[PDB]
Amino acid sequence: SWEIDPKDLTFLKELGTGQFGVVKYGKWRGQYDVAIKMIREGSMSEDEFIEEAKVMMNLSHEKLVQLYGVCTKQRPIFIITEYMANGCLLNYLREMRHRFQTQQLLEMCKDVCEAMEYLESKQFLHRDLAARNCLVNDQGVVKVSDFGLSRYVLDDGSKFPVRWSPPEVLMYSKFSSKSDIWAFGVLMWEIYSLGKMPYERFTNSETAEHIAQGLRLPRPHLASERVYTIMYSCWHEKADERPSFKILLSNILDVMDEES
Numbered sequence: 001s002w003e004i005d006p007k008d009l010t011f012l013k014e015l016g017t018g019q020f021g022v023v024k025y026g027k028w029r030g031q032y033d034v035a036i037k038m039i040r041e042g043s044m045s046e047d048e049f050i051e052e053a054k055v056m057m058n059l060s061h062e063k064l065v066q067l068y069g070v071c072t073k074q075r076p077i078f079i080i081t082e083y084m085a086n087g088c089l090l091n092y093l094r095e096m097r098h099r100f101q102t103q104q105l106l107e108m109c110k111d112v113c114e115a116m117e118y119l120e121s122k123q124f125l126h127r128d129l130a131a132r133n134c135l136v137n138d139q140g141v142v143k144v145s146d147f148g149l150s151r152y153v154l155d156d157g158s159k160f161p162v163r164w165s166p167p168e169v170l171m172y173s174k175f176s177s178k179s180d181i182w183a184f185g186v187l188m189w190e191i192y193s194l195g196k197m198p199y200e201r202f203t204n205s206e207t208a209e210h211i212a213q214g215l216r217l218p219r220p221h222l223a224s225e226r227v228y229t230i231m232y233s234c235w236h237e238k239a240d241e242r243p244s245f246k247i248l249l250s251n252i253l254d255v256m257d258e259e260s
């Protein structure tokens with residue numbers, strides 16, 4: 001299967017602490033550069049996680065973080081992925097030294113929209129889409145990661161992911177691809193806001209109340225009326241009125257072509 005021999009891994013440097021444990025940079029078989037995420041003990045429903053992991057291993061798309069294998073015959077569990085040099089997109093946006101161009105911001109939205117259109121086509125829900133869960137490689141390409149892992153988190157008022165959730169999730173936990181749509185719109189807002197906190201002046205519970213009342217994030221300065229109309233369309237009250245990732249990608253492609 002997708003089992004990797006942990007004895008063929010080398011830990012050269014700890015890149016930081018992510019969701020479900022620490023992440024290392026090392027070599028696989030002394031040939032390939034990889035990132036090894038060590039699942040912290042007691043942070044996930046490991047049995048359910050290992051099975052579904054095999055399903056996620058078969059998901060293949062350029063804009064999804066490439067999964068190489070796992071190390072489940074031991075503890076802590078190891079996840080071997082490709083090394084994204086520029087790390088977390090959120091910290092990447094909050095790096096003013098990069099001086100992102102508007103065209104680059106739209107390119108980052110398209111990268112994420114490609115992966116979500118693929119996940120949508122396979123009927124796989126991410127359920128925690130946000131800049132913090134996206135990664136960037138040396139070439140500046142954004143890729144989606146941690147898709148579908150919140151299902152196996154072990155919880156140990158309103159929590160932080162409320163700021164990326166539509167009303168039906170806040171009130172009923174009715175997760176669907178349409179709730180990924182909403183979250184993607186907030187992701188576009190983070191991008192064009194260069195990592196700004198959504199609803200920065202509000203607590204989690206207050207954000208939930210304002211969302212249920214119809215409050216929407218404002219138009220970022222770096223976003224044109226055309227771009228803001230796309231991210232704003234992810235925020236229709238009725239889940240069935242929100243466009244699919246097919247339409248979102250189609251819209252983003254149209255704007256990019258006009259800017260060509």
Ligand SMILES: Nc1ncnc2c1c(-c1ccc(C(=O)Nc3cc(C4CC4)ccn3)cc1)nn2[C@@H]1CCCN(C(=O)C2CC2)C1
Pocket residue numbers: 015016017018023035036037049052053054056057065067079081082083084085086087088089091135145146147148149
């Ligand atoms: N690959 C990287 N390359 C460079 N850095 C990386 C990573 C990662 C990483 C590694 C693996 C995974 C994973 O398991 N995804 C997955 C698995 C499955 C498996 C069930 C089948 C299913 C879906 N997604 C997710 C993130 N994390 N990190 C830094 C961590 C610390 C914070 N970071 C920062 O940048 C801030 C310091 C600035 C990023």
